[PDB]
Amino acid sequence: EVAAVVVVGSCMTDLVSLTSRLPKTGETIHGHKFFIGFGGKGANQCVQAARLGAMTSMVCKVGKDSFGNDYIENLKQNDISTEFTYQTKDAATGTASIIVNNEGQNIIVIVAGANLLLNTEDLRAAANVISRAKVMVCQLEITPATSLEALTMARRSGVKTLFNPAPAIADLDPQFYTLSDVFCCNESEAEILTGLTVGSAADAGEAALVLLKRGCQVVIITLGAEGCVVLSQTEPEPKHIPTEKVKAVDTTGAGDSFVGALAFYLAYYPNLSLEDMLNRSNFIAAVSVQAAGTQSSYPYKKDLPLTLFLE
Amino acid sequence: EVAAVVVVGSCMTDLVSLTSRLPKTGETIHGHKFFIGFGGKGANQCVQAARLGAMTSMVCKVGKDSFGNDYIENLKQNDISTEFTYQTKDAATGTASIIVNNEGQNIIVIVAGANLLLNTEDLRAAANVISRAKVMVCQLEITPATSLEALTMARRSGVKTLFNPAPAIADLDPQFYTLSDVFCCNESEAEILTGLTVGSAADAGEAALVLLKRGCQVVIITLGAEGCVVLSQTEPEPKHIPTEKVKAVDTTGAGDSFVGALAFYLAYYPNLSLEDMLNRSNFIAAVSVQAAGTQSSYPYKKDLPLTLFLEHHHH
Ligand SMILES: Nc1ncnc2c1ncn2[C@@H]1O[C@H](COP(=O)(O)OP(=O)(O)NP(=O)(O)O)[C@@H](O)[C@H]1O
Ligand SMILES: Nc1ncnc2c1ncn2[C@@H]1O[C@H](COP(=O)(O)OP(=O)(O)NP(=O)(O)O)[C@@H](O)[C@H]1O
Ligand SMILES: [Cl-]
Ligand SMILES: [K+]
Ligand SMILES: [K+]
Ligand SMILES: [Mg+2]
Ligand SMILES: [Mg+2]
Numbered sequence: 001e002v003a004a005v006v007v008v009g010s011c012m013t014d015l016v017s018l019t020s021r022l023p024k025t026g027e028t029i030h031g032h033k034f035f036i037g038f039g040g041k042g043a044n045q046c047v048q049a050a051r052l053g054a055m056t057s058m059v060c061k062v063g064k065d066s067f068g069n070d071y072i073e074n075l076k077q078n079d080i081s082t083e084f085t086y087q088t089k090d091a092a093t094g095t096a097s098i099i100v101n102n103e104g105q106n107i108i109v110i111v112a113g114a115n116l117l118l119n120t121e122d123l124r125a126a127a128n129v130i131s132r133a134k135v136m137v138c139q140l141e142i143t144p145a146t147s148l149e150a151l152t153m154a155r156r157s158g159v160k161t162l163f164n165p166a167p168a169i170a171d172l173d174p175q176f177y178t179l180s181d182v183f184c185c186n187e188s189e190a191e192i193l194t195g196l197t198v199g200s201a202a203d204a205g206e207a208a209l210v211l212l213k214r215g216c217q218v219v220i221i222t223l224g225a226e227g228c229v230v231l232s233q234t235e236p237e238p239k240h241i242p243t244e245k246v247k248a249v250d251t252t253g254a255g256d257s258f259v260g261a262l263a264f265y266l267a268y269y270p271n272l273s274l275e276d277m278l279n280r281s282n283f284i285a286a287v288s289v290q291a292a293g294t295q296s297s298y299p300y301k302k303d304l305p306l307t308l309f310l311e
Numbered sequence: 312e313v314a315a316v317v318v319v320g321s322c323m324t325d326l327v328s329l330t331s332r333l334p335k336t337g338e339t340i341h342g343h344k345f346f347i348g349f350g351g352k353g354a355n356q357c358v359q360a361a362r363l364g365a366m367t368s369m370v371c372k373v374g375k376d377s378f379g380n381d382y383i384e385n386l387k388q389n390d391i392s393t394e395f396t397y398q399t400k401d402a403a404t405g406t407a408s409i410i411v412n413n414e415g416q417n418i419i420v421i422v423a424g425a426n427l428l429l430n431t432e433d434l435r436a437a438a439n440v441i442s443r444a445k446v447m448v449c450q451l452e453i454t455p456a457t458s459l460e461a462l463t464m465a466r467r468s469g470v471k472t473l474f475n476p477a478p479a480i481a482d483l484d485p486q487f488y489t490l491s492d493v494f495c496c497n498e499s500e501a502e503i504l505t506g507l508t509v510g511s512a513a514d515a516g517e518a519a520l521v522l523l524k525r526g527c528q529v530v531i532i533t534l535g536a537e538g539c540v541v542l543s544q545t546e547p548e549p550k551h552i553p554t555e556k557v558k559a560v561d562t563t564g565a566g567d568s569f570v571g572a573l574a575f576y577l578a579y580y581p582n583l584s585l586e587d588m589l590n591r592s593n594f595i596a597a598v599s600v601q602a603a604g605t606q607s608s609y610p611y612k613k614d615l616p617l618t619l620f621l622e623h624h625h626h
Contacts, residue, residue, distance in 0.1 A: 015326050017408050022336050023418040028478075034406045034422035066377045095345045097328050097408055099420050105336055107418075109328045109410050111345035167339070 003057035003081055004134040004267040005049045006159075008123065008150035009042020010115045010141035011060045011075075011085075012094040013067040014294065022101050031099070038074045038295050039096055040115070041139040041166055041256050048260025048284070048298045049137075050078050053309075054267060057081035057133075059126050059150070060142075061118040067093035068114065074295075084126040088114050094141075115142050120149045131157040134267035137259065139164045144173060151179035160266055164259050168192040178215035184262065185211075186222045186255055204229040205238025212236060218274065220262075222255055227282050230274060241275060243282040246290055253294030258285035260298070269311060280308050314368035314392055315578040316360045317444040317470075319434070319461040320353020321426045321452030322371045322386075322396075323405040324378040325605070333412050342410070349385045349606050350407055351426070352450045352477055352567055358389045359571025359595070359609045360448075364620075365578060368392035368444075370437045370461070371453075372429040378404035379425070389606075395437045399428050405452075415561070426453045434460050442468035445578040448570065450475045455484070462490040471577055475570050479503035489526035495573065497533045497566055515540040516549030523547060529585060533569055535562070538593050541585050552586060554593040557601055564605035569596035571609070580622065591619050 019031035038047075042060060050056045058080050062068030064087045071093060075082050094113040100106045123130075123146060130136060136154035138147040138161070154161050163180040165172060168189035177183065187198040190207040198204050201223060208219040208231050218232040227243040261281035265272060272280075284299060291297035301309065325348035334340045353371055361367045369391050373379030375398040382404060386393050405424040411417045434441070434457065441447055447465035449458045449472075458474075463486075465472050474491040476483060479500035488494065498509040501518040509518050515532040519542050522530045529543040538554040572592035576583060595610060602608035618625055 015406075015408060017406065017420040017422050019420055023420060024335075025333050025416060025418060028419040028421060030478075031420050031422045034403050034408075034424055036403075066381075070377070092345050095326075095328070097326060097345075097410065099408065106339075107334045107336060107410075108339040109330060109334065109342050110339065111328050111342045113345060 001055050002132050003055045003129055005046070005054045005056045005137065005263050006059060006126070006130055006133040006135070007042050007046040007056065007137045008059040008142070008147065009045070009137065009139045010040035010094060010112070011043040011058070011062050011071045012040035012096050012110070012115070013071065014039040014096045014098060016098045016100065018100050020102055022099060022105060022107055037293060038071060040094060041141050041164065042137070043071070043075065044253055044256030044294060045137055045164070045260040045263060046080055047078050047295050048257045049264045050080050051298050051300045052261060052264040052284070053301045054264045057083060057129055059084040059118070059123065061086040061088055061114045061122065063087065063091060063093035063114045064089045065093055067095070083129070084122070086118065086122055088117050091117055112141060118142050118146050120146060123149050123153065127153060130154060130159060133159050135160045135162055135263050137162045137164070137263050139166050140168065148173065148175055148179065155179060162259065162263055162266060165189055165193060166255070174214065177211065180216045182218045182220065182262070182266070183211055183216040184220040184222065184259055187224070190221050201226060201229050201240040205231065208238060209236065220278065222258055224251065228278055230278055232274070239275060241278045241282060243286050246286050248289040250292045250297065251289045253297060254285045254289050256294070257288035257298055258282070261285065272311065283308065312366055313443055314366050314440060315445040316357070316365045316367045316448065316574050317370060317441055317446070318353045318357040318367065318448040319370040319437070319441070319458065320356070320448065320450045321351035321405060321423070322354045322369070322373050322382045323351035323407045323421065323426070323452070324382065325350040325407045325409055327409045327411060329411050331413055333410060333416060333418055348604065349382060351405060352452050352475065353448070354382070354386065355564055355567030355606060356448055356475070356571040356574060357391055358606050359568045360575045361389050361391050362609050362611045363572060363575040363595070364612045365575045368395055368440055370395040370429070370434070370441070372397040372399055372425045372433065374398060374402060374404040374425045375400045376404055395440060397429065397433050399425050402428050423452060429453050429457050431460060434464060438464060441465055441470065444470050445581070446471045446473055446574050448473045448475070448574050450477050451480060452478070455480065459484060459486060459490070462487070466490050473570070473574055473577060476500055476504065477566070485525065488522065491527045493529045493531065493573070493577065494522060494527040495531040495533070495570055501532050512537060512540055512551040516542070519549055520547070531589065533566060539589055541589055543585060550586060552589045552593060554597050557597050559600040561603045561608065562600045564608060565596045565600050568599040568609055569593070572596065582622070584624065587624055594619065
C-alpha cells in the first residue's frame with residue numbers, strides 16, 4: 001500500500017475543560033466537564049484525508065507516555081501508516097490545554113513538546129516513502145528546519161507541496177513560500193502574515209496576492225462560512241468560492257478538515273480544476289462543522305454524497 | 312492491619328503547563344513544559360498521613376481511564392489501601408488544569424468529574440471500614456451530600472470526624488457543623504463561611520467562635536506562615552499556635568499536609584492535647600513548604616525529628 005499523502009507535522013493531545021466562566025490570575029474555578037481529544041493540525045489533516053479513502057503516512061514524534069501510545073493507536077484506527085511515527089522519552093507528547101466557556105470564549109496553552117524533537121535524521125529515514133507520494137502536507141506546529149527539509153525533499157522528487165502556515169508568525173522564513181505549491185491559510189493567519197486587514201472576500205484577495213508575490217504557486221484563504229478565495233501564478237485574479245449555509249454545531253477543526261480534503265483531491269483527483277477541488281473541500285469542511293469535536297466530526301467517504309468522488 | 316485513618320474524598324490529576332506569562336480571555340499562548348501530577352485534597356491528606364506511618368484507606372472514585380489507573384498506582388506507591396478506590400465509565404477522573412508562569416503565579420480550572428459520582432452505594436460498601444476507623448477525614452471536593460453521608464456514618468459508629476470544608480460553600484447544611492468533631496479550614500474558607508474578614512489571628516479567633524456556636528466540637532483556622540488558631544467546646548478561648556519561620560520554596564499543598572498530619576495525630580496519639588497536635592502538624596506542613604511540588608514535598612516519618620512521635624506532651 002504506497003502512501004499517496006504524506007503528512008510531516010504535529011500530533012497533540014487536546015485537554016479540554018468546559019466552564020461557565022474563565023479564570024483570572026490567581027483564581028481557581030470549577031468547570032462542569034473535561035475531555036481528552038486527539039488533535040494537532042498535522043494529524044487532523046491526515047485523519048480527514050484517510051477517512052476520504054487516501055493511503056496516508058504520518059511522520060511525527062510523540063512521547064514515550066500514555067498520551068503517545070494512545071495517539072499511535074488513534075492513527076492506526078484511522079488506517080494511517082505509523083511507520084515514521086516516532087516516540088521519545090525526552091519530551092511529553094504535545095498538549096493543547098483548552099478552557100472554554102458556554103459562549104465559546106477560550107484560553108489555550110499549547111506545549112508542542114515531543115513534536116519539536118522530530119528532526120532531519122528522522123525525516124531522512126522516510127525519504128523513500130516521500131519520494132513515492134503524490135502530496136506532502138506541512139504546517140507550522142513542529143520545528144521550522146524539519147518542515148523546510150520535508151518540503152525540500154518533496155520538491156526534489158516532484159511531489160506536490162501543500163503548506164498550511166498555521167499558527168502564523170509575522171516574519172516567516174521566505175523559503176516557506178518558495179517551497180509551497182499550494183499555500184492555504186485562514187483570514188486571521190493572512191492578517192498576521194501580510195499586515196493587511198481581512199474583513200471581506202475582496203480583502204482576502206489582496207492579502208492572497210501578497211503571499212503569491214512572496215513565491216507561492218497557488219494561494220487559498222479560507223473564510224469560514226464565506227467559503228474560500230483562490231489565486232495562482234497562472235490566474236492571479238481572485239476567485240471567491242462560496243459555500244451553502246449550514247447550521248454549525250462546532251466549527252473547531254474545520255480548517256484542518258478543509259486542508260485534509262484538499263490533500264486527498266490533489267493526490268487522487270489531479271485532473272479536477274482547482275475550483276472544483278475547492279468546492280468539494282468546502283463541502284466536506286462544512287459537514288465537519290455540523291458535529292461536535294475535531295477528529296470525531298470528520299466525515300467518512302461512506303457517509304458523504306457520491307458526487308464528491310466522481311471525476 | 313486495620314486502617315486507623317479513612318479519607319472519604321477526592322483524587323484529581325494535575326495537568327500542568329509552564330509558561331512565561333499567564334493568558335487572559337481569548338488568548339492562545341505557547342508554554343515550554345507540560346507534566347502530570349497527582350492531587351486532590353482527599354488524596355493529598357491521605358498521602359501525608361500515610362507517610363507519617365498511618366494505616367490509611369482512601370474511599371474515592373476515579374474514571375475507568377488511564378488517569379484513574381495511574382492514580383490507583385500512586386496510592387499503592389504511598390502504601391495506601393486501595394480497597395475502596397472505585398472506578399466509573401460514567402465520568403472522567405477529576406482534573407485540575409493548571410497554568411503556571413515563571414514567578415509561580417497560576418490559573419486553575421478544576422473539573423471534579425468522577426469524584427462527584429462517589430455515591431451512597433459506594434459508601435455502604437465502605438461502611439465496615441469507615442465504622443472501624445479511628446478518624447474519618449472528608450472535604451468538599453466530592454458531592455456535599457456524600458461527605459455528609461460519610462460524616463453521618465462515622466458519627467453513628469463513634470468514629471472521630473475531621474471535616475475540612477474546602478472549597479467552602481456559603482450555605483453549607485447545618486448538619487456539617489453538628490457532625491464535625493474537628494472542623495478545620497483556612498482564612499479564605501472562614502471568610503466564606505462566616506462573612507467576616509479573616510486576615511490575622513485575631514480575625515480567625517472571631518470567625519472560629521461563630522463556627523463553634525454552629526455545633527462543632529473543635530474549630531481550627533489555619534493562617535499560612537502564622538500557624539493556626541484553635542478553640543473547642545471545652546476551651547472556647549482562641550489559642551494561637553505560631554510556627555517557626557522557614558524559607559518557603561513552594562507553599563502548594565501545605566494545607567493538605569497540615570490536615571493529613573492532624574489526622575495522623577488524632578488517630579495514633581488521641582491522648583494528646585489539641586495544642587500539642589497542632590504544634591506538630593504546623594511543623595510538618597512547614598517542612599512541605601521547603602520543597603517543590605505537592606505530594607512529592609510531603610515528608611516521611613524517617614526524615615522527621617523523633618520529638619514529633621513521642622506519646623506524651625513535649626515542651
Ligand atoms: N460556519 C461555517 N459554515 C460552513 N462552512 C464552514 C463554516 N466554518 C468553516 N467552514 C468551512 O471550513 C473551512 C475552514 O474554516 P476556517 O474557519 O477558515 O478554518 P480555520 O480557521 O483554519 N480552522 P482550523 O484550522 O481547524 O483551526 C471554510 O473555508 C469552510 O469551507
Ligand atoms: N510560608 C509558610 N511558612 C511556614 N508554614 C507555612 C507556610 N505556609 C503554610 N504553612 C503551614 O501550612 C499550614 C496550612 O497552610 P495554609 O496556607 O493555611 O493552608 P491552605 O491555604 O488551606 N492550603 P491547601 O489546602 O493545601 O491548598 C499552616 O497552618 C502552617 O502550619
Ligand atoms: Cl515545548
Ligand atoms: K466540528
Ligand atoms: K510544597
Ligand atoms: Mg486552519
Ligand atoms: Mg486547605
